[PDB]
Design a binder for this molecule. Structure first.
Ligand code: ICS
Ligand code: ICS
Ligand code: CA
Ligand code: CA
Ligand code: MG
Ligand code: MG
Lengths: 522, 477, 522, 477
C-alpha cells in the first residue's frame, strides 16, 4: 500500500509488514535457503585468517577486480582530441559498456562507435565492417579524426587494423588524408591504462613518424604534457593552471576536460575542446615531454625518446608536497621560467593546512587501491601526512612498480607496517581489512561492499570508505575534484581529516555514554 | 505532426547517410498505423546493426549474464573471458534480491576468469576447472555455478560443456555452460534465447522424477520479471492477495530451487514476452503448463491483468480479485487525482529494449500523457505487432535507432519528456528535455503494480515539472 | 591502564571497565542523581508539542543563541584593511574571546588589541587608556591604521570615542595624520553583523566625509564592492575572480582574504593584503557601490547614498542561480562590460549539475539558520533545487527581512510548508526538528548538539547536520569553501546531494535487511 | 643562553616600547635564579595589563563562569548581560562530565539573558526573575542556578542578590549571584576568588547541621581539577585504587551535592592552588579540614604525590599506595622507553594561566626535555615562588607576556616546542615551531596521572617529530 502524501520507494516500502511477511513466505516455501545459523557461521569464517590464507592461494578465480580492459582506456584517450570520434573495431556490446561506464562516472554523454562485427566475420575478418564503419561514422557524426582501437573478438580473429584502414582509403570509403590513427588494444593484456598508452602512442606515431626530418627539439619553446588515464576534471585543470601561472608554454596531449563538462544550455555538443591536430604534428618541436603517469606510459615514453629525441624527465606523478615541488622545479629548469610567487604561496598554504591537521591524521591506518601512479602518489602523500598506508593494493600493478613503492615506504618510518599487493582483487582486500583492520579505506565505489561486510561483523569492525579513484558511481560530482598538485593535496587532506572527524563524532554521539568526548571544537 | 510530416522527417534525417546505410535504416523507421496487424508490412527488426552508426544495443552476454542468469541469487555466475565484460556489468542492473552477499547470495559480485594471453593461446578449460574448485572452497554455500562465455571462448575452441559435465559430476553440483559470446546474434536478444535453452537443458528438468512437492490448484510462476527496484515483489503481493501461490520468480530475486519447482505450477504468468517466451513455450510442450501474457504497468493494465489471470481459476479467486481491486482503488485514484492534473497532455518519447517501449504506454495514459514516439533496441516483429495497436495513429516507431536519428527526431518532435537509458540521459538533459531512465528507473521504483504506479507518477512529475528546466537560457542571451 | 603500543585518549579510555565502575560509584555515592527513568521521562517530554509550546512562550530566557555581539563584527571588518590593527576600547576579556572565536574557525592567527579598561575607569572614563593604548599599539605592532570599536563597559560608562581620539592626537600620543577611524559598537544592540556595518561606515566616513568636494561619481570607472561579515575565504575570492573575468574595474572594501590565509613558510605575518587607504579615499569616485549582504549593511547604505551619491542597486546576496544572474547583469549594466563566455559556461555547468542531481534533491526538507543574507540566499537556492526549507531560523533577523523571505517562499510551490522565525534560538529549533522532523539541518557547529539530541530519541528520528555557516569548529578547513556565485552554488549542491546519498547508504547498509537498496550506482 | 644573553634579550625586546610601557614590562620579565625563595625580589605580577600591547589574558567572568562554575554539571549557569560572553565561552573549555545534556546536565549549553537596550536603560532584575521562572519550567531537573554577571550588571546598578534571595525562597532553590563582571580585577584570577566566595556564601554551608552522611577515615576531595579531557577521572582512579574515597571533584564533572558534602571530608587535595586556595583556606578555618598541594603530571610527580597523600592516613593506605605504584611502574616505564629517546634534549617554552606553567615541568623532564622558558597570564607571586625552584638556572620567566615579547623571545631562543593557548598556536606553527595546546590539550588528553602521561608523551612526540616541520622551506628558496 501507499499513502499518497508520503510515497515510499523500495526503501522503505519493502519493510512494511505485508511485504516482510510475503518475503518470509517466499523464502520458506520455495527458496530452500541455508539456515540462518549456517549463514552466520560461514560469514564469520570468511572474516578469519584461515579464510584469508585460502583466499590468497587463488590462482584461477578473480573476485571483484579493481581494473578494467584496454579499449576503455583507448576510448578515454581518444576523447581528448579535437572533434575526434573514438571507434572500436570489433563487437558492439563492448562499446555499450564503455559508454555506460563513463556515463555513470562523469554524468555526461560519452560518444563512441563500433563497427558491429558479428559471427560471420570469423570466416574472413572485419575488413568490410571497417570500410562501411569508417564511411558511415564520418558521414553521420562528422568527426575530424577517427581513433581506432579493438575488442577481443577482433584481436582473436587477427584483424590487421593498419591493412584494413589502408584498404578503406584505397577503395574510397574515407579520404586519403583523413586522420585514422589506430592501436591494437587486446583486453587479455594489461588493463584499461595499457589501452590508453597504446592509443596515445598510435596517435603520436600517426602525426609525427613520417615528418621527423624538419623537426628541431626546443624550436617551439613549449613543454608537452601527457596526462594518461585521468578521470578527475580538476586534474587536467590544475596542470594547465599551474603551467599558465608560471608563464610556461605547453601542449596538453589528450585533453578531454571540455567534452566531459559541456554546459546544459539547450544544445548537445558531441565534441568540445581537445588537443588539436596542429598540436600533435608540432609536438616533436617541444623542449621536452613530461609524462604525468609514467607507470602506464611506457610505450609512449619509448616513442617520444626514440623518435622525438626528447629526454623525458624521471618524474613521479605530481601528487603530494614533495612530488609537486619536483614537478615544478623540473618544469622551471626545462622552460627557464621561475616558480612564481603565486605557487610558492599556494605551497605554503598546503603546508599550513598540514600543520593545522596533523594531530588528527597522525598514525591513522589506511587500506587503498587504484591504478599504479595514483596509488603511489596517494601512498607518498599519506606518508607526508604522518599516516600509515598499511594495505596497498594495485590489481594492475607490476613487479617493478611494487619495488618502487617498497622503496618509498622504506624512506619513511610511516611505511613500517605497510605491504604492497599486485595482482590481487577486492575480495583479497576484504580479507585484509578484517584480519588487520585499518581505520579507513580510500578507494572507488566498489569499496562500499567491503564497508557493508565489515559492519555486518559489528560496528566496532566497520571500515568506512573514503571515495577517491575511479569509478565513483554512488556520489554526485566527485569527478570535478582534484588530486594533483598543491590544490589536489589540499583537497585530499581536507577529505581525510574530515572523514576522521565525522567518524569520531559518530562514535561520540551517544548521550551519557560516549558524548563526554563530543567536543564542539576539534 | 501529421503522417506526412513524420514521413518527411524520416526522409530528411536519412539524407545524412551513405546509400547502403540509408537504404537499411529506412526499413527500420515507420509511421504507426494502428489499423495494421502484420508489422512485417511496416518495419524490419532483429537484423544486424549498421557499422559506425552508434547503435544503443548491447550483446548476447548482456542478454544472458546481465539479464537472465545474473539475477539468480544463490548461484555463482562466472564471467568467462577477459576482465571487461564482468566489470562493466557488475551491479549495473538493479535486479533486487534478499540475501547475505558473499555468503549465500552473489548477485552484485563479479566472479571472472580474467583471461590473459596464455589463456587465449592455450585455452581456458584448465583454468576454468581450477576456478570451479576455488569457488567451491571460498563460497561453500553456493547452490550452483553458471559459466557465462565472453567473446573469446568459442573463437578459441574451448569446451566449457565438457568442463561443466566433468566438474558437475565430480562435485555433485549443477554447473551450467552458457554459450552467450557477444559475437553471436545481433543484440541482447539472442542472449535471452541462449540463456533460456541453458535453463532448459541444465536446470529445469532436475526434479522431473521427484513427487515430493505438494501442489495446489492456485500455483503460478512469474516469468520474465527481473525485479528492477523491487518490481517483482510489488507484483507478487497482488497475486498472493488474489489467492494465488507464487512458486517462482524468473529471475528477479530468484533462487535455483524455485526454477526447479516451476514445472509443478498450474499457470505461467509472462511479463517479459521477449526474454522468456522461449522457456514458456517449452514448459507448455513438455509439462502441459499454459502461459499467458500480462501487464502490471499502471492501474488500467494491472486491473485488466488481475481479472484475466483470475478468470483462469475458480470463482473463489475471481472474488478475491475483485477484493484486491476494491482495496487499491482509493490508493491509485488518489495518485491520479494528485498527479494527472500536473501531467495531462504532456508528450513522451520512449526508447528501451524489448518490452517496456509498449508495456508502459497504459501507465502514461493513466496520467493523461501521450506517447508520441517509441521504439526498441532489439525487439522482433512479434513485439511490433503488439505495439502498433497500443500506439496512436501517426506516431513514430524506430527499431535499433541510431544516436543521430534519435537526436534529430527529438529536435523536431520536441517531446516534454524522454524515457530511455543511461547512454541517452545526459544528451537530452543538455537539450533542456526532462529525462527519466526507463531501464534503471533512475534509482527509484518499483514501477510495477499499484504500489509502483504511485512511485512512477511521483517520478514523472518530479522530473517533468522540475524548476531546473526553466533555467537553461541565460537571461542575457 | 594503558598499553603502550595502542594508547587510548579519553575516548575510548573511559569505557574501560575500571573507569566505568569508578564513575558508577561516583554517581551513586555523591551525585544524588535523578533516577534514569525520570531522566528518560523528562527527555521524552522535551521532544513534544506541549514542550514546544512552552518553549516558544519564552520572553526572558535565551538558550543556545545563533548570534554573537557587535565588536566581533567590527574586528572582522577592520581585519580587511591594509596593515590595520583592530582595537577594541574597553574590557580586555572581550578581545581574548573575539580572537579565540575566529582562531578556532579560520585556524589562523587573529590580531586585535584592547586598551584594558578596569573598574577604576568608571570614575572618569577611559581617556587615558585610549591615549596610552594608541601610542603603545602603534609603537609595538606598527600598524598603518588603528580601527577602534567598543565593548559594553565602555558604552555603559559613555566614553566619547571621537573626543578621546581627538585628544590623543592633540596631546601627541599618536600623529595627527595617523588614521584612527572609529565606531560605537554596543553589544546590547543588534548582533555581530551590526558591528560590521557600524565599523565599515566609520571607516568610510573617516576617509571621505571631509573630502567630498573634489569627487565625481564614475570618474574612476570602478564599482565598489562591500562584502559584509563574511567567514568563507572562497566568497571574497569568487567575487574578485568573477569581476576580473568580466574585465570590470572594482574595489573590494574590507578584504581579509590574505591575512586569514598566510602561508606557513617560517615567518609570522601579522598583516597581509587588505583594502588600501587609497582605495577608501578614492571610493566616492566609483560608478556605484554594490552591497553583497544588504540586510546588514543599512547604515553603510545610507552613508554611501547620502554622502557619496551612489545609487546603490537593489540586489540580493549573489547566492544561487537567479541571484548570481541578477548580480552579473547589474554589474554589466553599471560597468558597460559584457558577461563573458567563461561565466556563461560556468552558469551552464551549474545548471547541468542541477539536472544531474534533481531526483535526489526533490522534496527534501531542511531546517536551517544563520545570518539574514546567508539564510535568505540559502532558502532561495533550496527552492531552485526543488527542496523544501521548512524551518528557517534567523536569531538576529528583523520583521522587514522576514517579510522579504516570506515573499520569496510565496514565489515557489516549494515554499508551502516553510515558516520563518526571527528572535528564536537553537533551543527553539531543537523543538521544531522533533515536532516537524526535516530530513537534514544546514547550520553551524552548534547544530551538532541538536543532532545528538535527535539520535537519542532514536535512529529514525535523527536529523543529520550539514555544516554551512559560522562558526564551524569541529571540521577542518571548511572556511576555505565558497557559497556565493555559480561556484558556491555548485559547492552547496554537491554537499547537499552527497549528504543525502551518504545517509541513504547508512540506512541501506544492513545485510539482508535493507541492503536490497544498497545500489552501486545512484 | 647565558644569564647575560637572556638579560640583553630582555632589554633588546623592550626597546620597542614607549617609556611608560617599557618601565612597566621590565618588572614582569626575569632571568630565573633557583637560589631565590622570595619572588617579590625578582618579578612583579597580578597587576593591570598595559593598554594596547596584546595581552593574552581574559577577564573575571572567564575565571568565574568559564573556569569555576561552568563545569558544575547539574546546575544551570546564566550568562547575565549581552550575548557575546556566553556565546564565545560556550563549550570552549573541555571540562568533561557524565550526564544527559539538556535534561539533567547543562554544561555545554549557553543560557543567557541576552541584554538589549531596554535592559541597560531600565535594569535587568525583572528580566532575571522571569528568566528564572522560564528555566524552572523548561529544565525541571536542574538542581540549582548561578547568575554569572557580565560587565554591564554592576555598572547599571542591578541587584542580583535580591533577585537570587527572593526567587530562591519562592522556589526553594539554590540560586547563586556571582559578581564576576569583567571590569573587576585585572584577569581571570579575581574571578576565581569571587567564584570561591560565592560557593562559600551560597552553597557550601547547606548541610552544616546535617549529620546523615556516612563518613569514613579515608574521605577526600579533589580541589581544583576541572577534568580537562578527563584529567580528574584519571586522577580519581589512582586515589581510589590507593583506598581513598573521593567524595567530591571541584569542579570538573562536579555536582552540587558533592560540593555540599565536601565539608564532611578528612582532607582536601589541592591541584590548582591558584583557583581554589581561597575555599581550601576557608574550609580549614571553618571545618578544620587540612589541605595539601599535589601534582599528577608525569610519573615522578604522581608517585611523590601519592606517597605524600598516603602519609596522611594509616598503614593500610600506605601499603595500597605502594601497590598502586608497583602496578603502574611497567606502564609508565614502557612509555618512557618508547618516547624519551624521541624527545631527549628537546627544549620547550611554555605560556599558560596560573598553574600548568610550573606544574607540567616534571612531566617534560620525565621525557628528557628541558623547559627553557615559562610564564603565566595571571599568576601571583606565591605562584612564582613555587616556580623558581622548578625551573633551571638562567631560564626565562615572563608574567602577562605581550604578543610582541613572546614572538621575539621565541625568535631568539628557538625552542623545539611551544606549549601555550589557541591565540598563540597558529602564530608559532607558521614560524615552523611545533606547538601543543596546553589548555585544551589540543583536543586530546587526559594528561593527569599514569594514564594521562602515556597520552602526553604520545602527543609531544607526534607533534615535535612530525614530518610536516621539515617542509616549510620551498626547495627553490
Ligand atoms: S528483460 Fe529485457 S533493455 Fe524484458 S534485455 Fe533489458 S529488465 Fe529493458 S525493456 Mo534494460 S526486454 Fe527487461 C529489459 Fe526489457 S535490461 Fe531490462 S530495462 S523487460
Ligand atoms: S583553573 Fe586556571 S588558563 Fe588552574 S584559569 Fe585557566 S583548567 Fe589554565 S593553567 Mo586555561 S590556573 Fe585550570 C587553568 Fe590553570 S582555563 Fe585551565 S588551562 S589549572
Ligand atoms: Ca552532467
Ligand atoms: Ca592555519
Ligand atoms: Mg579518531
Ligand atoms: Mg577500547
Amino acid at each position: 500500500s501507499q499513502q499518497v502524501d508520503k510515497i515510499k520507494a523500495s526503501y522503505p516500502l519493502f519493510l512494511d509488514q505485508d511485504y516482510k511477511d510475503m518475503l518470509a513466505k517466499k523464502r520458506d516455501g520455495f527458496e530452500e535457503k541455508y539456515p540462518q545459523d549456517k549463514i552466520d557461521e560461514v560469514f564469520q569464517w570468511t572474516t578469519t585468517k584461515e579464510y584469508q590464507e585460502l583466499n590468497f592461494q587463488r590462482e584461477a578465480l578473480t573476485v571483484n577486480p579493481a581494473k578494467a580492459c584496454q579499449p576503455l582506456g583507448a576510448v578515454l584517450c581518444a576523447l581528448g582530441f579535437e572533434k575526434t570520434m573514438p571507434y572500436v573495431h570489433g563487437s558492439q556490446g563492448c562499446v555499450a559498456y564503455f559508454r555506460s561506464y563513463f556515463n555513470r562516472h562523469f554524468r555526461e554523454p560519452v560518444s563512441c562507435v563500433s563497427d558491429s562485427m558479428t559471427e560471420d566475420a570469423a570466416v574472413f575478418g572485419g575488413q568490410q565492417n571497417m570500410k562501411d564503419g569508417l564511411q558511415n561514422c564520418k558521414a553521420t557524426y562528422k568527426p575530424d579524426m577517427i581513433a581506432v582501437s579493438t575488442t577481443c573478438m577482433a584481436e582473436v580473429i587477427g584483424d590487421d587494423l593498419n591493412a584494413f584502414i589502408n584498404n578503406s582509403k584505397k577503395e574510397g570509403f574515407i579520404p586519403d588524408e583523413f586522420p585514422v590513427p589506430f592501436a591494437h588494444t587486446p583486453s587479455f593484456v594489461g588493463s584499461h591504462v595499457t589501452g590508453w598508452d597504446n592509443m596515445f602512442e598510435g596517435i603520436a606515431r600517426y602525426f609525427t613518424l613520417k615528418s621527423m626530418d624538419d623537426k628541431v627539439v626546443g624550436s617551439n619553446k613549449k613543454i608537452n604534457i601527457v596526462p594518461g588515464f585521468e578521470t578527475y576534471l580538476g586534474n587536467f585543470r590544475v596542470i594547465k593552471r599551474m603551467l599558465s601561472e608560471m608563464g610556461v608554454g605547453y601542449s596538453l596531449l589528450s585533453d578531454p576536460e571540455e567534452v566531459l563538462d559541456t554546459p546544459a544550455d539547450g544544445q548537445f555538443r558531441m565534441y568540445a575542446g581537445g588537443t588539436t591536430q596542429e598540436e600533435m604534428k608540432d609536438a616533436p618541436n617541444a623542449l621536452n615531454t613530461v609524462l604525468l603517469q609514467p607507470w602506464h606510459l611506457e610505450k609512449t615514453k619509448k616513442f617520444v625518446e626514440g623518435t622525438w629525441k626528447h629526454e623525458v624527465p624521471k618524474l613521479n606523478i605530481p601528487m603530494g608536497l614533495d612530488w609537486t615541488d619536483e614537478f615544478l622545479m623540473k618544469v622551471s629548469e626545462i622552460s627557464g621560467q621561475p616558480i612564481p610567487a603565486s605557487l610558492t604561496k599556494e605551497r605554503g598554504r598546503l603546508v599550513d593546512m598540514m600543520t593545522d591537521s596533523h594531530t588528527w591524521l597522525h598514525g591513522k591506518r589506511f587500506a587503498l587501491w587504484g591504478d599504479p601512479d595514483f596509488v603511489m602518489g596517494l601512498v607518498k602523500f599519506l606518508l607526508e601526512l604522518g599516516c600509515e598506508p598499511v594495505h596497498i593494493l594495485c590489481h594492475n600493478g607490476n613487479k617493478r612498480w611494487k619495488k618502487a613503492v617498497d622503496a618509498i615506504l622504506a624512506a619513511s618510518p610511516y611505511g613500517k607496517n605497510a605491504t604492497v599487493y599486485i595482482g590481487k582483487d577486492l575480495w583479497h582486500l576484504r580479507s585484509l581489512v578484517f584480519t588487520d583492520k585499518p581505520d579507513f579505506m580510500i578507494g572507488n565505489s566498489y569499496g562500499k561492499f567491503i564497508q557493508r561486510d565489515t559492519l555486518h561483523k559489528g560496528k566496532e569492525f566497520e571500515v568506512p570508505l573514503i571515495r577517491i579513484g575511479f569509478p565513483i558511481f554512488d556520489r554526485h560530482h566527485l569527478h570535478r575534484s582534484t588530486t594533483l598538485g598543491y590544490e589536489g593535496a589540499m583537497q585530499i587532506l581536507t577529505t581525510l581529516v574530515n572523514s576522521i572527524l565525522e567518524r569520531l563524532d559518530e562514535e561520540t554521539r551517544g548521550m551519557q555514554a560516549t558524548d563526554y568526548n563530543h567536543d564542539l571544537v576539534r | 505532426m501529421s503522417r506526412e510530416e513524420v514521413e518527411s522527417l524520416i526522409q530528411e534525417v536519412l539524407e545524412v547517410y551513405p546509400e547502403k546505410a540509408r537504404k537499411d535504416r529506412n526499413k527500420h523507421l515507420a509511421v504507426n498505423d494502428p489499423a495494421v496487424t502484420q508489422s512485417k508490412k511496416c518495419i524490419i527488426s532483429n537484423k544486424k546493426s549498421q557499422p559506425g552508426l552508434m547503435t544503443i544495443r548491447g550483446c548476447a552476454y548482456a542478454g544472458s549474464k546481465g539479464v537472465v542468469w545474473g539475477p539468480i541469487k544463490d548461484m555463482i555466475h562466472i564471467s568467462h573471458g577477459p576482465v571487461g565484460c564482468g566489470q562493466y556489468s557488475r551491479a549495473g542492473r538493479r535486479n533486487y534480491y534478499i540475501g547475505t552477499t558473499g555468503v549465500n547470495a552473489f548477485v552484485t559480485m563479479n566472479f571472472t576468469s580474467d583471461f590473459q594471453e596464455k589463456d587465449i593461446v592455450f585455452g581456458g578449460d584448465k583454468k576454468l576447472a581450477k576456478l570451479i574448485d576455488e569457488v567451491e572452497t571460498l563460497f561453500p554455500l553456493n547452490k550452483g555455478i553458471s559459466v557465462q562465455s565472453e567473446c573469446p571462448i568459442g573463437l578459441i575452441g574451448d569446451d566449457i560443456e565438457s568442463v561443466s559435465k566433468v566438474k558437475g559430476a565430480e562435485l555433485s553440483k549443477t554447473i551450467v555452460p552458457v554459450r552467450c559470446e557477444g559475437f553471436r546474434g545481433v543484440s541482447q536478444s539472442l542472449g535471452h534465447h541462449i540463456a533460456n535453452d541453458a535453463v532448459r537443458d541444465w536446470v529445469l528438468g532436475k526434479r522431473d522424477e521427484d513427487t515430493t512437492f505438494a501442489s495446489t490448484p492456485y500455483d503460478v510462476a512469474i516469468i520474465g520479471d527481473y525485479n528492477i527496484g523491487g518490481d517483482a515483489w510489488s507484483s507478487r503481493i497482488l497475486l498472493e492477495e488474489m489467492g494465488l501461490r507464487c512458486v517462482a520468480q524468473w529471475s528477479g530475486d530468484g533462487s535455483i530451487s524455485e526454477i526447479e519447482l516451476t514445472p509443478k505450477v498450474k499457470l505461467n504468468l509472462v511479463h517479459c514476452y521477449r526474454s522468456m517466451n522461449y522457456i514458456s513455450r517449452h514448459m507448455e510442450e513438455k509439462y502441459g503448463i499454459p502461459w499467458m501474457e500480462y501487464n502490471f504497468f499502471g492501474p488500467t493494465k494491472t486491473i485488466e491483468s488481475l481479472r484475466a489471470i483470475a478468470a483462469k481459476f475458480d470463482e473463489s479467486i475471481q472474488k478475491k480479485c475483485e477484493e484486491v481491486i476494491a482495496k487499491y482503488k482509493p490508493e491509485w485514484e488518489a495518485v491520479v487525482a494528485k498527479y494527472r492534473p500536473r501531467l495531462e497532455g504532456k508528450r513522451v518519447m520512449l526508447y528501451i529494449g524489448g518490452l517496456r517501449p509498449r508495456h508502459v504506454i497504459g501507465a502514461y495514459e493513466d496520467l493523461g500523457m501521450e506517447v508520441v514516439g517509441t521504439g526498441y533496441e532489439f525487439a522482433h516483429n512479434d513485439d511490433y505487432d503488439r505495439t502498433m495497436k497500443e500506439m496512436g495513429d501517426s506516431t513514430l516507431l524506430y527499431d535499433d535507432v541510431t544516436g543521430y536519428e534519435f537526436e534529430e527526431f527529438v529536435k523536431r518532435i520536441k517531446p516534454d519528456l524522454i524515457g530511455s537509458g543511461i547512454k541517452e540521459k545526459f544528451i537530452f538533459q543538455k537539450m533542456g528535455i526532462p529525462f527519466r531512465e526507463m531501464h534503471s528507473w533512475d534509482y527509484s521504483g518499483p514501477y510495477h503494480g499499484f504500489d509502483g504506479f504511485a512511485i512512477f507518477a511521483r517520478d514523472m512529475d518530479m522530473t517533468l515539472n522540475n524548476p531546473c528546466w526553466k533555467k537553461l537560457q541565460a537571461p542575457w542571451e
